[PDB]
Design a binder for this molecule. Structure first.
Ligand code: CL
Ligand code: CL
Length: 354
């Protein structure tokens, strides 16, 4: 039940192998938290990574956006079967308005691309982009991983709840979950803890501003906070009912897509799971290309694993947990290094428990 030896074998070699300046890992095993840090937050300062170092989690942010959408749905300010035009009047009657909010959250809205075109740089251009978008397939049939897609779901969740996404996410979700060192906008105080990321040429970088950045990939967090978030997902029973249902809402499977099941936010697998099936579900093809999606009833009994990868130009992250086993792991790193290496390391550690 002690993950330390497995973490040292699985994670420590990664820094030299992928030229990663710094990395933080936390494992939870039946409520006991284990923290491991490697390397440095900055090549210039050489200050050590700690469990309180802020890293960009990239698309792991979509699990928080799903939680916000689940909070909105539990409150009844929105329904996942609604269409965008009920909340954004300028989108009523447009082709994307055939999609339901559930399709936006599962990347099945009709072929929204990975990223906005470079010409979309503000809210006006965002509205016009969605008005003009011509879907390449019917909703619910094709999964195409998409930042604009989950971005729009977060924008609509904020509009429904009657506030700014950043303020709602910070106050109702992050603070509500006890994540007091997690931010969409890092405060002046917490800035001292924010690592630098290191791009392909080893230049220090942080995530650039973009449309729907906060909504799709903009959270900064620490392993101390992210392991608490994972523990909420493992057992949300201690949460106040609104947040409890918001968390549970991210664990409902909606589509079978080959070896993986698509939730809002999380992606799920049976457990135990062969690493090969986890690698297949987390492949580059899965993230880059259209995949046939089959609507299913939610799987619900026995053991399941939930995960989400995330990256920015300078950072890489991975989170995975198994509620029935009360085990979970998060890795945050200040280099975007290959997802298969992240998944393999994390799977090896979880497999070594029991
Ligand atoms: Cl984008
Ligand atoms: Cl920031």
């Amino acid at each position: 039940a002690d993950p330390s030896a497995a973490v040292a074998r699985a994670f420590a070699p990664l820094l030299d192998q992928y030229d990663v300046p710094g990395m933080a890992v936390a494992v939870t095993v039946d409520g006991r938290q284990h923290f491991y840090e490697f390397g440095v937050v900055s090549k210039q300062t050489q200050a050590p990574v700690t469990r309180d170092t802020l890293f960009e989690i990239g698309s792991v942010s979509k699990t928080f956006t799903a939680t916000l959408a689940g909070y909105a749905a539990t409150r009844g300010v929105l329904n996942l079967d609604d269409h965008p035009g009920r909340y954004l009047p300028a989108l009523a009657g447009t082709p994307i308005d055939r999609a339901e909010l559930r399709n936006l959250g599962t990347y099945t809205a009709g072929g929204l691309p990975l990223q906005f075109p470079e010409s979309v740089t503000d809210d006006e251009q965002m509205i016009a982009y969605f008005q003009q978008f011509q879907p390449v397939t019917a909703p619910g049939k094709i999964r195409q991983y998409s930042n604009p897609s989950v971005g729009l779901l977060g924008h609509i969740s904020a509009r429904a709840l009657g506030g700014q996404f950043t303020d709602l996410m910070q106050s109702q979700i992050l603070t509500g979950l006890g994540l007091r060192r997690s931010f969409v906008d890092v405060t002046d105080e917490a800035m001292d803890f924010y690592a630098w990321g290191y791009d392909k040429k080893n230049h220090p970088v942080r995530v650039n501003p973009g449309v729907f950045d906060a909504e799709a990939y903009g959270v900064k967090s620490t392993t101390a906070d992210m392991i608490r978030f994972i523990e909420h997902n493992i057992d949300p029973g201690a949460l106040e009912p609104t947040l409890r249902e918001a968390v549970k809402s991210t664990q409902v499977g909606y589509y079978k897509v080959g070896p993986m099941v698509q939730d809002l936010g999380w992606e799920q697998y049976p457990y135990p799971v062969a690493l090969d099936q986890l690698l297949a579900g987390n492949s580059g093809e899965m993230a880059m290309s259209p995949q046939a999606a089959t609507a299913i009833a939610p799987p619900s009994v026995g053991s399941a694993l939930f995960n989400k990868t995330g990256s920015t130009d300078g950072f890489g992250a991975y989170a995975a947990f198994v509620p029935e086993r009360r085990i979970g792991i998060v890795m945050l790193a200040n280099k975007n290094f290959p997802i298969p290496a992240r998944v393999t390391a994390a799977h090896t550690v979880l497999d070594a428990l029991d």
